[PDB]
Design a protein around this nucleic acid. Structure first.
Ligand SMILES: Nc1ccn([C@H]2C[C@H](O)[C@@H](COP(=O)(O)OP(=O)(O)OP(=O)(O)O)O2)c(=O)n1
Ligand SMILES: [Ca+2]
Ligand SMILES: [Ca+2]
Ligand SMILES: [Ca+2]
Length: 341
DNA sequence: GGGGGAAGGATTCC
DNA sequence: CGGAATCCTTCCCCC
């Protein structure tokens, strides 16, 4: 089995360099402005020029501007990158439509029938890469190996504009020396827990007692890591696609006034519906970040689809429910529709 | 003991 | 001082 992975280099930031090439060679920074008055928000992504001075994804627009006050800060136009994305995905769609669209800028292609041997697999990466760069001037990185996870790791290493193949022997070595931190689906909050239990690499997950792990990193993530350490990992390449659509916003101020929140909630719904389109959702969740930035969401699953009218209808009580079981001040508020039909 | 789901909490950037 | 989703663990009715 040979899986070819593709990941768009600094996607958002880059796309903006396509619609306005004057920025390349310059620090570009895509941002999300909340509006709770100026500079407030976060960073979505930053090109490499920007990254090398400390500007990464996740930092407050203010702390970033202290590093590059002369950098270009563009608000995020997700709808744009989305289209640009779909294009690169449909182009890929046929190099093996036994492909999985992981995210707005990720995909997995099972090139088993379409080819064998890495040599060729590689030569089909520049092929794929070359095409995308030509047809859309976007630089991407490719990963190749026996399974999805490792294919990604190959790409994550040689980025950007890279193409790396890490098959069989190297796999063993990574299972031995790769840093647990760097394992797909292993964020910060999971990496440290993992050090505590004395694990810093994949292989180490075979020395610890299966229970200590479920005990801490959840039976879910637990089985995952072990499976990898035994290079007994294998999950087909099947386009697994979106199972929830929502919209969340920041109230100009924090509060517990039902009639003050209501408007943002009704704006979130309205937009969620529009983005839902023809897809009919059977479950609805009212979400609201507390000021200590926690996440409390009260939902519901009907035995049938939700008409916008109903969305409005239940959204209110789910919201009333929340206030009714928590206490904190709701900073941001929204809704999320799932269980489509 | 466990299927089958709905619900609420946490985590990753999937 | 963001925003979108997913992941995942506990609760629940009941055969
Ligand atoms: N806290 C975060 C983290 C990431 N993203 C966005 C940034 C990108 O728009 C998208 C994909 O980011 P990746 O990390 O997968 O890849 P990058 O876009 O960062 O490029 P690169 O992997 O080459 O660094 O996720 C976000 O909105 N908020
Ligand atoms: Ca990327
Ligand atoms: Ca990515
Ligand atoms: Ca990591």
């Amino acid at each position: 089995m040979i899986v070819l992975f593709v990941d768009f280099d600094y996607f958002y930031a880059q796309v903006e360099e396509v619609l306005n090439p004057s920025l390349k060679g310059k620090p570009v920074v895509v941002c999300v402005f909340s509006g709770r008055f100026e500079d407030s928000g976060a960073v979505a992504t930053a090109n490499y020029e920007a990254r090398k001075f400390g500007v990464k994804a996740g930092i407050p627009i203010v702390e970033a501007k202290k590093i590059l006050p002369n950098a270009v800060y563009l608000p995020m136009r997700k709808e744009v990158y989305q289209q640009v994305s779909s294009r690169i995905m449909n182009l890929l769609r046929e190099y093996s439509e036994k492909i999985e669209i992981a995210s707005i800028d990720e995909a997995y292609l099972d090139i088993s029938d379409k080819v064998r041997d890495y040599r060729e697999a590689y030569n089909l990466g520049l092929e794929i890469k070359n095409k995308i760069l030509e047809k859309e001037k976007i630089t991407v990185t490719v990963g190749i190996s026996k399974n999805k996870v490792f294919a990604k790791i190959a790409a994550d290493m040689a980025k950007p504009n890279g193409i790396k193949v890490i098959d069989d022997e190297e796999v063993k070595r990574l299972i031995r020396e790769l840093d647990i931190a760097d394992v797909p689906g292993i964020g910060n909050i999971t990496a440290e827990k993992l050090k505590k239990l004395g694990i810093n690499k994949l292989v180490d997950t075979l020395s610890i007692e299966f229970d200590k792990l479920k005990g801490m990193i959840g039976e879910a993530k637990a089985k995952y890591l072990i499976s990898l350490a035994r290079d007994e990992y294998n999950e087909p390449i099947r386009t697994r696609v979106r199972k929830s659509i929502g919209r969340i916003v920041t109230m100009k101020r924090n509060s517990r006034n039902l009639e003050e929140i209501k408007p943002y909630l009704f704006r979130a719904i309205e937009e969620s519906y529009y983005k839902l389109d023809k897809r009919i959702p059977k479950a609805i969740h009212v979400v609201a970040v507390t000021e200590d930035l926690d996440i409390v969401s009260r939902g519901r699953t009907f035995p049938h689809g939700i008409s916008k009218e109903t969305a409005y209808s239940e959204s209110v009580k789910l919201l009333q429910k929340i206030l009714e079981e928590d206490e904190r001040k709701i900073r941001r508020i929204g809704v999320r529709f799932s269980k489509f039909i």
